[PDB]
RNA sequence: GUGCUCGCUUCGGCAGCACAUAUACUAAAAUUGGAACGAUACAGAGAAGAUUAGCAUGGCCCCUGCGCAAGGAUGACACAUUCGUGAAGCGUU
RNA sequence: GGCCUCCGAACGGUAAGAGCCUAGCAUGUAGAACUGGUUACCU
């Protein structure tokens, strides 16, 4: 029987969230010069 | 992991959406117009 | 919702009342808040509560409170000594945080029921650990902690005292110290090492008394059995040379093409094989 | 999900909890179910008695005394009635022992089951057996310097405060731990550590042995000094006084083994009568702390070196000091040792040098001998000379032993043995084959 | 050795990470770091460095060549094979990848493999020179019919 | 989510001008293929702006 | 535990029935390892020759601040000469 | 015929730091072992 635990309404935020950790998908294929121009 | 922090700016304001009325220029009129 | 659990924790009662907190505790490993579950396992029991978040269990495939494997009930260092160390996972700080994050997405994309990469490996087993795996529930593990007033001689709650009144464990024994992180990563785990020392003594694999000998000295035959049991067991291995049979002492000698096959039949067999519902015991010469 | 009537759940849960038998919930156990799921001893016997339903029979009530009127005061017990019935010495001891052990880890013990061997002998009593002879003449031969280290020793989890050998010949070796512990060792590279000693509150600072070799003295930062039986580990006597006691020596003279001489942080040096335990003779002349005390000639004189940068030499048991040596130049003398010939002193001055002072009546430091290949900014240390006075070995903060040629006055050899700073270095007085060192890393090494 | 070597590695290693974190990209920092670990034969670390660099900038063809090269130098044939496949899959237009990929397979002896690669390559309808190389490939063996086809 | 402000406005405008030119032109000018004069073209920008301030 | 069975039936005991149905981070403990902007010590503010005003940019750096405000040293962090190998591909004598 | 304002607080100044040494602060954990085996034939 699962019961949800009652939370104390005057309880402050318990724990600290601020911590920061560094930031994808495999790249999709791209499928897309003269000397003078250079 | 959602913080219990708040800010003044964030609070409710203009919770209603002003829909255009018929004389204001509801889309119904617009569709019909030449 | 709902924890991941040993059968041994959850309780010996089938009826159970179990409570839930949304973000109860940090997990002592990946150090995040996670849903926590308490329940009473039994009459004299302790109110266990989940110690680690569900993710890092799926990661190393373990109970949330015990951190013992689901199938084997073995500390992680053991079942890694049993198969594959190369799972790994960063211990170090911000890596741990990072790798946990990514692996949390990877798990999110799985069928859900599978301990990630390990399960691809996890099927192939039985080398030893099955034979050192624990069989029945072990309830001595949920007993209440040792009353620490009484262990100084004073405890003034009398019989009421829910704690336990008895002699504690001598801090001398290396099996005492037992960090959590440590038990998780499989470092210098005293328990796991003990089980390793126990693994070695298993009379089993060294064999090789003499060269080329494929002779199998089989004790504990019994007079119910036929040879055909033997052959239809042993054709898996290869080309038999022959089989000698003695039913007066109920010992059966066997001979195979190569010694390799005989070693095998030892291995596969030793203190494992039984047919005709009767144990078939094996020895060299 | 499931949607089971709550009340029935309670009925089954209590039924199981109380008696051990409850009808099992399953759906596909057989795909049809006929079976209970409890221990079942109760279930056959009790016919599925529900907690809510009245039990068919009642048994074994236990009484709790009650007064319910409430007219009385103090008197009244309500439902607060403390069961009349319910109000080991054998155990009372094991627990205590455990506690003691725990404390120690943060009472004396004996190491090894060897006890008394052959005729009936102290472990201390005889060595005879090791290659060479402990009784041995003073100069073994032309001396040697070691490369190879033989024993770690350990035991100590903290750097050894001090290391000393054994009166007469290096039969035993004894170490001081800052974990409040003292251990005896074979001194022959042998694994065994004899008998452990425990009884100090705080790290043990220094020790000394009975010239005969049966008694043993220790001084610690706990403001106490103890006299020990080297053969039992028995704390024979404890000497008081408010001041922390630094280096302590036992009078060397056969006539007066009894007298302790303790150097105090509080200027004074004090002679203690061992038998009375009473103070015999205070020496107040010194200003500042006292660091070390030796005896330049046995019985007659000793040299005290003090927190103030001076040496005080005295006759024995007489308070005044005949010779006082100070030079504005010299930084300090934390450790001073005396040559086996009784002719030279060697101080490890803070200033990063070794100073030789003539043992001979003229206590004048000599320019000819000096040592400065090593650095101790400000560390206590031991300086020793290879028997035969061939070499001098200093132990330093950096951890490298410095071996000098006395005759030639030059760093002949140097080792980087130890990864933490090293203090006392002892050359085995009988064997030329080795020296013994200790230092913060907590290990005793043999070179 | 045992500890003395170790400290050196921390100073270098830490420095490499600092450089990367400061500039983020500028993949000469990435590459130098990879090279150093390769030289110490810590190639599992090296692999992770290369993968991290790829996460930053997967289009950079020098990076990929250094990565594949590293695997080949350490005889890690199958790693190299994987890598080559990825390179041509994500950056098909880069002809350098194709030329190296076929060369590697040829050296390994896997003519069939190389043929397969070239057939993939040709699907991109590349450049006159690529076709010539495919034909020449065939002509290093008799295989005249193949060439004509 | 810092908010534009009087202290930050001049810095803001020049920041997003350097970005405007950078994105536009390096997505507009290219075929250098390696790095095309980004530091340099921007230095030409500041140079020109100073020159117009000095007339 | 309270009440009731024209309960056995005296006023003691016993029986039946009704009502009443699962507390609790159990410890009044034991252990276990990051921070004080303390003193001490060394050293000592970005930009150009110096002295200084500042807004910014970037985030495995924070702090004060209710704050999408503003401060924290601009908070800190930010270090002209002259070519040739080796391999591969393509075309040619 | 009348007509009588205000009223106070915050930082922007005493360095920024690196180091060493020493109370302080959180946890109230999880887990603690294991047994039983035979030889017999022709030259
Ligand atoms: Mg200023
Ligand atoms: Mg600012
Ligand atoms: Mg700034
Ligand atoms: Mg300012
Ligand atoms: Zn975790
Ligand atoms: Zn568990
Ligand atoms: Zn108790
Ligand atoms: Zn006299
Ligand atoms: Zn005088």
mmCIF file of N, CA, C and O (backbone and C1' of nucleotides) in Angstrom, chain G residues 17-59:
data_model
loop_
_atom_site.group_PDB
_atom_site.id
_atom_site.type_symbol
_atom_site.label_atom_id
_atom_site.label_comp_id
_atom_site.label_asym_id
_atom_site.label_seq_id
_atom_site.Cartn_x
_atom_site.Cartn_y
_atom_site.Cartn_z
ATOM 1 P P C G 17 -18.231 -14.895 21.839
ATOM 2 O "O5'" C G 17 -19.245 -13.672 21.815
ATOM 3 C "C5'" C G 17 -20.520 -13.826 21.175
ATOM 4 C "C4'" C G 17 -21.382 -12.621 21.429
ATOM 5 C "C3'" C G 17 -20.744 -11.280 21.137
ATOM 6 O "O3'" C G 17 -20.583 -11.063 19.744
ATOM 7 C "C1'" C G 17 -21.897 -11.136 23.166
ATOM 8 P P A G 18 -19.469 -10.052 19.234
ATOM 9 O "O5'" A G 18 -20.139 -8.648 19.561
ATOM 10 C "C5'" A G 18 -21.476 -8.290 19.119
ATOM 11 C "C4'" A G 18 -21.869 -6.957 19.711
ATOM 12 C "C3'" A G 18 -20.791 -5.895 19.574
ATOM 13 O "O3'" A G 18 -20.744 -5.350 18.253
ATOM 14 C "C1'" A G 18 -21.605 -5.896 21.804
ATOM 15 P P C G 19 -19.322 -4.943 17.589
ATOM 16 O "O5'" C G 19 -18.930 -3.614 18.367
ATOM 17 C "C5'" C G 19 -19.794 -2.469 18.393
ATOM 18 C "C4'" C G 19 -19.375 -1.565 19.526
ATOM 19 C "C3'" C G 19 -17.926 -1.123 19.517
ATOM 20 O "O3'" C G 19 -17.814 -0.033 18.615
ATOM 21 C "C1'" C G 19 -18.571 -1.736 21.721
ATOM 22 P P A G 20 -16.678 -0.019 17.511
ATOM 23 O "O5'" A G 20 -15.345 0.138 18.377
ATOM 24 C "C5'" A G 20 -15.056 1.383 19.044
ATOM 25 C "C4'" A G 20 -13.861 1.265 19.959
ATOM 26 C "C3'" A G 20 -12.620 0.639 19.346
ATOM 27 O "O3'" A G 20 -11.900 1.595 18.573
ATOM 28 C "C1'" A G 20 -13.059 -0.321 21.466
ATOM 29 P P U G 21 -11.722 1.390 16.970
ATOM 30 O "O5'" U G 21 -10.446 0.453 16.866
ATOM 31 C "C5'" U G 21 -9.226 0.831 17.505
ATOM 32 C "C4'" U G 21 -8.098 0.047 16.902
ATOM 33 C "C3'" U G 21 -8.071 -0.009 15.373
ATOM 34 O "O3'" U G 21 -6.719 -0.057 14.922
ATOM 35 C "C1'" U G 21 -8.285 -2.185 16.241
ATOM 36 P P A G 22 -6.254 0.762 13.642
ATOM 37 O "O5'" A G 22 -4.669 0.649 13.744
ATOM 38 C "C5'" A G 22 -3.998 1.400 14.766
ATOM 39 C "C4'" A G 22 -2.555 0.988 14.933
ATOM 40 C "C3'" A G 22 -1.751 0.899 13.641
ATOM 41 O "O3'" A G 22 -0.403 1.218 13.970
ATOM 42 C "C1'" A G 22 -1.804 -1.197 14.649
ATOM 43 P P U G 23 0.569 1.989 12.945
ATOM 44 O "O5'" U G 23 1.155 3.157 13.847
ATOM 45 C "C5'" U G 23 0.287 4.213 14.214
ATOM 46 C "C4'" U G 23 0.876 4.963 15.369
ATOM 47 C "C3'" U G 23 2.246 5.582 15.164
ATOM 48 O "O3'" U G 23 2.122 6.841 14.517
ATOM 49 C "C1'" U G 23 2.104 4.600 17.305
ATOM 50 P P A G 24 2.906 7.133 13.185
ATOM 51 O "O5'" A G 24 4.414 7.133 13.677
ATOM 52 C "C5'" A G 24 4.850 8.058 14.680
ATOM 53 C "C4'" A G 24 6.162 7.601 15.272
ATOM 54 C "C3'" A G 24 7.219 7.141 14.280
ATOM 55 O "O3'" A G 24 7.857 8.262 13.699
ATOM 56 C "C1'" A G 24 7.067 5.558 16.014
ATOM 57 P P C G 25 8.483 8.141 12.231
ATOM 58 O "O5'" C G 25 9.953 7.603 12.518
ATOM 59 C "C5'" C G 25 10.892 8.400 13.256
ATOM 60 C "C4'" C G 25 12.257 8.307 12.623
ATOM 61 C "C3'" C G 25 13.296 9.294 13.149
ATOM 62 O "O3'" C G 25 14.549 8.647 13.371
ATOM 63 C "C1'" C G 25 13.137 9.470 10.801
ATOM 64 P P U G 26 14.604 7.061 13.586
ATOM 65 O "O5'" U G 26 14.710 6.918 15.168
ATOM 66 C "C5'" U G 26 14.292 5.710 15.831
ATOM 67 C "C4'" U G 26 13.063 5.971 16.668
ATOM 68 C "C3'" U G 26 13.270 5.901 18.175
ATOM 69 O "O3'" U G 26 12.349 6.750 18.850
ATOM 70 C "C1'" U G 26 11.859 4.132 17.494
ATOM 71 P P A G 27 12.554 7.079 20.402
ATOM 72 O "O5'" A G 27 13.617 8.266 20.381
ATOM 73 C "C5'" A G 27 14.805 8.179 19.572
ATOM 74 C "C4'" A G 27 15.938 7.585 20.373
ATOM 75 C "C3'" A G 27 17.193 8.445 20.476
ATOM 76 O "O3'" A G 27 17.084 9.337 21.581
ATOM 77 C "C1'" A G 27 17.756 6.159 20.043
ATOM 78 P P A G 28 16.390 10.772 21.399
ATOM 79 O "O5'" A G 28 16.694 11.514 22.775
ATOM 80 C "C5'" A G 28 18.018 11.588 23.277
ATOM 81 C "C4'" A G 28 18.063 11.386 24.769
ATOM 82 C "C3'" A G 28 19.374 10.843 25.320
ATOM 83 O "O3'" A G 28 20.346 11.856 25.519
ATOM 84 C "C1'" A G 28 17.555 9.631 26.242
ATOM 85 P P A G 29 21.458 12.165 24.400
ATOM 86 O "O5'" A G 29 21.854 10.734 23.825
ATOM 87 C "C5'" A G 29 23.047 10.562 23.072
ATOM 88 C "C4'" A G 29 23.472 9.116 23.030
ATOM 89 C "C3'" A G 29 24.778 8.825 22.307
ATOM 90 O "O3'" A G 29 25.922 9.069 23.109
ATOM 91 C "C1'" A G 29 23.126 7.304 21.583
ATOM 92 P P A G 30 27.274 9.616 22.437
ATOM 93 O "O5'" A G 30 27.752 8.424 21.497
ATOM 94 C "C5'" A G 30 28.170 7.181 22.043
ATOM 95 C "C4'" A G 30 28.480 6.189 20.953
ATOM 96 C "C3'" A G 30 29.515 6.645 19.936
ATOM 97 O "O3'" A G 30 30.838 6.407 20.378
ATOM 98 C "C1'" A G 30 27.617 5.808 18.805
ATOM 99 P P U G 31 32.068 7.198 19.716
ATOM 100 O "O5'" U G 31 32.530 6.253 18.520
ATOM 101 C "C5'" U G 31 33.189 6.793 17.384
ATOM 102 C "C4'" U G 31 32.526 6.349 16.106
ATOM 103 C "C3'" U G 31 32.898 7.138 14.860
ATOM 104 O "O3'" U G 31 34.111 6.677 14.283
ATOM 105 C "C1'" U G 31 30.540 6.842 14.961
ATOM 106 P P U G 32 35.249 7.714 13.829
ATOM 107 O "O5'" U G 32 34.778 8.194 12.388
ATOM 108 C "C5'" U G 32 34.551 7.266 11.337
ATOM 109 C "C4'" U G 32 33.730 7.898 10.247
ATOM 110 C "C3'" U G 32 34.214 9.264 9.780
ATOM 111 O "O3'" U G 32 35.206 9.173 8.771
ATOM 112 C "C1'" U G 32 31.874 9.328 10.200
ATOM 113 P P G G 33 36.713 9.776 8.926
ATOM 114 O "O5'" G G 33 37.090 10.153 7.417
ATOM 115 C "C5'" G G 33 37.431 11.495 6.959
ATOM 116 C "C4'" G G 33 36.229 12.118 6.284
ATOM 117 C "C3'" G G 33 36.312 13.625 5.977
ATOM 118 O "O3'" G G 33 36.189 14.129 4.629
ATOM 119 C "C1'" G G 33 34.377 13.073 7.317
ATOM 120 P P G G 34 36.959 15.512 4.191
ATOM 121 O "O5'" G G 34 35.847 16.457 3.528
ATOM 122 C "C5'" G G 34 36.221 17.725 2.885
ATOM 123 C "C4'" G G 34 35.044 18.682 2.742
ATOM 124 C "C3'" G G 34 35.334 20.191 2.782
ATOM 125 O "O3'" G G 34 35.511 20.932 1.569
ATOM 126 C "C1'" G G 34 33.709 19.667 4.405
ATOM 127 P P A G 35 36.027 22.480 1.627
ATOM 128 O "O5'" A G 35 35.084 23.208 2.697
ATOM 129 C "C5'" A G 35 35.321 24.604 3.080
ATOM 130 C "C4'" A G 35 34.217 25.151 3.977
ATOM 131 C "C3'" A G 35 34.522 26.433 4.770
ATOM 132 O "O3'" A G 35 34.197 27.705 4.177
ATOM 133 C "C1'" A G 35 33.734 24.762 6.246
ATOM 134 P P A G 36 33.802 29.007 5.101
ATOM 135 O "O5'" A G 36 34.757 28.963 6.388
ATOM 136 C "C5'" A G 36 34.234 28.841 7.756
ATOM 137 C "C4'" A G 36 34.355 30.114 8.604
ATOM 138 C "C3'" A G 36 35.140 31.309 8.056
ATOM 139 O "O3'" A G 36 34.262 32.425 7.984
ATOM 140 C "C1'" A G 36 36.168 30.468 10.051
ATOM 141 P P C G 37 33.504 32.791 6.628
ATOM 142 O "O5'" C G 37 34.675 33.316 5.684
ATOM 143 C "C5'" C G 37 35.994 32.744 5.742
ATOM 144 C "C4'" C G 37 36.931 33.606 6.562
ATOM 145 C "C3'" C G 37 36.333 34.842 7.234
ATOM 146 O "O3'" C G 37 36.763 35.089 8.582
ATOM 147 C "C1'" C G 37 37.862 35.464 5.483
ATOM 148 P P G G 38 38.213 34.614 9.089
ATOM 149 O "O5'" G G 38 38.187 34.896 10.663
ATOM 150 C "C5'" G G 38 38.803 36.087 11.216
ATOM 151 C "C4'" G G 38 39.566 35.821 12.508
ATOM 152 C "C3'" G G 38 41.060 36.142 12.458
ATOM 153 O "O3'" G G 38 41.436 37.445 12.908
ATOM 154 C "C1'" G G 38 40.761 33.861 13.013
ATOM 155 P P A G 39 42.426 38.281 11.990
ATOM 156 O "O5'" A G 39 43.863 37.974 12.608
ATOM 157 C "C5'" A G 39 44.087 38.009 14.012
ATOM 158 C "C4'" A G 39 45.150 37.021 14.427
ATOM 159 C "C3'" A G 39 46.463 37.103 13.664
ATOM 160 O "O3'" A G 39 47.327 38.105 14.173
ATOM 161 C "C1'" A G 39 45.755 34.852 13.772
ATOM 162 P P U G 40 48.346 38.865 13.198
ATOM 163 O "O5'" U G 40 49.386 37.724 12.790
ATOM 164 C "C5'" U G 40 50.206 37.109 13.767
ATOM 165 C "C4'" U G 40 50.837 35.859 13.228
ATOM 166 C "C3'" U G 40 51.610 36.012 11.928
ATOM 167 O "O3'" U G 40 52.895 36.581 12.099
ATOM 168 C "C1'" U G 40 50.191 34.135 11.762
ATOM 169 P P A G 41 53.340 37.860 11.207
ATOM 170 O "O5'" A G 41 54.107 37.222 9.973
ATOM 171 C "C5'" A G 41 55.077 36.191 10.154
ATOM 172 C "C4'" A G 41 55.005 35.157 9.064
ATOM 173 C "C3'" A G 41 54.981 35.670 7.637
ATOM 174 O "O3'" A G 41 56.241 36.070 7.144
ATOM 175 C "C1'" A G 41 53.317 34.037 7.884
ATOM 176 P P C G 42 56.441 37.576 6.633
ATOM 177 O "O5'" C G 42 56.882 37.424 5.112
ATOM 178 C "C5'" C G 42 57.570 36.263 4.672
ATOM 179 C "C4'" C G 42 56.928 35.681 3.440
ATOM 180 C "C3'" C G 42 56.647 36.670 2.318
ATOM 181 O "O3'" C G 42 57.790 36.910 1.511
ATOM 182 C "C1'" C G 42 54.749 35.282 2.672
ATOM 183 P P A G 43 58.209 38.407 1.103
ATOM 184 O "O5'" A G 43 57.065 38.881 0.102
ATOM 185 C "C5'" A G 43 57.091 38.495 -1.265
ATOM 186 C "C4'" A G 43 55.700 38.382 -1.835
ATOM 187 C "C3'" A G 43 54.996 39.690 -2.164
ATOM 188 O "O3'" A G 43 55.382 40.198 -3.434
ATOM 189 C "C1'" A G 43 53.522 38.248 -0.984
ATOM 190 P P G G 44 55.545 41.776 -3.690
ATOM 191 O "O5'" G G 44 54.131 42.220 -4.264
ATOM 192 C "C5'" G G 44 53.255 41.275 -4.874
ATOM 193 C "C4'" G G 44 51.820 41.694 -4.716
ATOM 194 C "C3'" G G 44 51.583 43.176 -4.983
ATOM 195 O "O3'" G G 44 50.392 43.366 -5.732
ATOM 196 C "C1'" G G 44 50.812 42.622 -2.813
ATOM 197 P P A G 45 50.476 44.252 -7.056
ATOM 198 O "O5'" A G 45 49.120 45.075 -7.038
ATOM 199 C "C5'" A G 45 48.606 45.624 -8.232
ATOM 200 C "C4'" A G 45 47.188 45.181 -8.449
ATOM 201 C "C3'" A G 45 46.406 46.009 -9.461
ATOM 202 O "O3'" A G 45 45.456 45.180 -10.127
ATOM 203 C "C1'" A G 45 45.382 46.168 -7.336
ATOM 204 P P G G 46 45.927 44.046 -11.166
ATOM 205 O "O5'" G G 46 46.886 44.808 -12.196
ATOM 206 C "C5'" G G 46 46.422 45.871 -13.017
ATOM 207 C "C4'" G G 46 45.550 45.384 -14.147
ATOM 208 C "C3'" G G 46 45.563 46.237 -15.409
ATOM 209 O "O3'" G G 46 46.619 45.865 -16.277
ATOM 210 C "C1'" G G 46 43.322 45.693 -14.795
ATOM 211 P P A G 47 47.937 46.770 -16.397
ATOM 212 O "O5'" A G 47 47.950 47.240 -17.914
ATOM 213 C "C5'" A G 47 47.297 46.477 -18.913
ATOM 214 C "C4'" A G 47 46.448 47.366 -19.777
ATOM 215 C "C3'" A G 47 46.884 48.823 -19.843
ATOM 216 O "O3'" A G 47 47.943 49.089 -20.756
ATOM 217 C "C1'" A G 47 44.545 48.696 -19.469
ATOM 218 P P A G 48 48.481 47.992 -21.807
ATOM 219 O "O5'" A G 48 49.503 48.817 -22.703
ATOM 220 C "C5'" A G 48 50.812 49.097 -22.225
ATOM 221 C "C4'" A G 48 51.111 50.571 -22.273
ATOM 222 C "C3'" A G 48 51.632 51.174 -20.977
ATOM 223 O "O3'" A G 48 53.019 50.943 -20.735
ATOM 224 C "C1'" A G 48 49.893 52.529 -21.841
ATOM 225 P P G G 49 54.172 51.341 -21.793
ATOM 226 O "O5'" G G 49 54.926 52.544 -21.082
ATOM 227 C "C5'" G G 49 56.016 52.306 -20.211
ATOM 228 C "C4'" G G 49 56.105 53.369 -19.152
ATOM 229 C "C3'" G G 49 54.962 53.410 -18.156
ATOM 230 O "O3'" G G 49 55.081 52.442 -17.133
ATOM 231 C "C1'" G G 49 55.392 55.589 -18.927
ATOM 232 P P A G 50 53.760 51.905 -16.406
ATOM 233 O "O5'" A G 50 53.382 53.080 -15.402
ATOM 234 C "C5'" A G 50 54.287 53.491 -14.393
ATOM 235 C "C4'" A G 50 53.736 54.665 -13.634
ATOM 236 C "C3'" A G 50 52.271 54.561 -13.258
ATOM 237 O "O3'" A G 50 51.997 53.637 -12.203
ATOM 238 C "C1'" A G 50 52.648 56.663 -14.223
ATOM 239 P P U G 51 51.966 54.038 -10.647
ATOM 240 O "O5'" U G 51 50.566 54.769 -10.467
ATOM 241 C "C5'" U G 51 50.458 55.855 -9.568
ATOM 242 C "C4'" U G 51 49.309 56.769 -9.904
ATOM 243 C "C3'" U G 51 47.923 56.165 -9.856
ATOM 244 O "O3'" U G 51 47.466 55.995 -8.529
ATOM 245 C "C1'" U G 51 48.117 57.643 -11.706
ATOM 246 P P U G 52 46.499 54.769 -8.171
ATOM 247 O "O5'" U G 52 45.068 55.449 -8.070
ATOM 248 C "C5'" U G 52 43.955 54.872 -8.726
ATOM 249 C "C4'" U G 52 43.309 55.851 -9.667
ATOM 250 C "C3'" U G 52 42.066 55.349 -10.368
ATOM 251 O "O3'" U G 52 40.923 55.463 -9.544
ATOM 252 C "C1'" U G 52 43.496 56.396 -11.935
ATOM 253 P P A G 53 39.823 54.297 -9.529
ATOM 254 O "O5'" A G 53 38.726 54.821 -10.554
ATOM 255 C "C5'" A G 53 38.311 56.175 -10.528
ATOM 256 C "C4'" A G 53 37.265 56.449 -11.573
ATOM 257 C "C3'" A G 53 36.333 55.302 -11.906
ATOM 258 O "O3'" A G 53 35.323 55.115 -10.933
ATOM 259 C "C1'" A G 53 37.019 56.381 -13.893
ATOM 260 P P G G 54 35.339 53.814 -9.991
ATOM 261 O "O5'" G G 54 34.339 52.805 -10.707
ATOM 262 C "C5'" G G 54 34.757 52.060 -11.840
ATOM 263 C "C4'" G G 54 34.070 52.542 -13.091
ATOM 264 C "C3'" G G 54 33.208 51.526 -13.813
ATOM 265 O "O3'" G G 54 31.933 51.432 -13.209
ATOM 266 C "C1'" G G 54 34.510 52.786 -15.366
ATOM 267 P P C G 55 31.084 50.077 -13.304
ATOM 268 O "O5'" C G 55 30.270 50.266 -14.652
ATOM 269 C "C5'" C G 55 29.393 49.261 -15.117
ATOM 270 C "C4'" C G 55 29.126 49.431 -16.584
ATOM 271 C "C3'" C G 55 29.026 48.144 -17.377
ATOM 272 O "O3'" C G 55 27.754 47.531 -17.267
ATOM 273 C "C1'" C G 55 30.488 49.614 -18.482
ATOM 274 P P A G 56 27.567 46.263 -16.298
ATOM 275 O "O5'" A G 56 27.669 45.016 -17.280
ATOM 276 C "C5'" A G 56 28.936 44.554 -17.718
ATOM 277 C "C4'" A G 56 29.145 44.823 -19.184
ATOM 278 C "C3'" A G 56 29.400 43.597 -20.043
ATOM 279 O "O3'" A G 56 28.213 42.910 -20.399
ATOM 280 C "C1'" A G 56 31.038 45.202 -20.517
ATOM 281 P P U G 57 28.068 41.344 -20.065
ATOM 282 O "O5'" U G 57 29.002 40.640 -21.141
ATOM 283 C "C5'" U G 57 28.966 41.016 -22.510
ATOM 284 C "C4'" U G 57 29.956 40.207 -23.301
ATOM 285 C "C3'" U G 57 30.039 38.749 -22.877
ATOM 286 O "O3'" U G 57 29.090 37.958 -23.570
ATOM 287 C "C1'" U G 57 32.220 39.689 -22.952
ATOM 288 P P G G 58 28.275 36.813 -22.801
ATOM 289 O "O5'" G G 58 29.391 35.735 -22.465
ATOM 290 C "C5'" G G 58 30.080 35.039 -23.492
ATOM 291 C "C4'" G G 58 30.859 33.905 -22.896
ATOM 292 C "C3'" G G 58 30.392 33.497 -21.511
ATOM 293 O "O3'" G G 58 29.210 32.707 -21.506
ATOM 294 C "C1'" G G 58 32.711 33.817 -21.453
ATOM 295 P P G G 59 29.217 31.126 -21.793
ATOM 296 O "O5'" G G 59 29.663 30.499 -20.394
ATOM 297 C "C5'" G G 59 29.963 29.114 -20.288
ATOM 298 C "C4'" G G 59 30.701 28.765 -19.017
ATOM 299 C "C3'" G G 59 29.833 28.497 -17.784
ATOM 300 O "O3'" G G 59 30.346 27.364 -17.078
ATOM 301 C "C1'" G G 59 31.477 30.135 -17.283
#
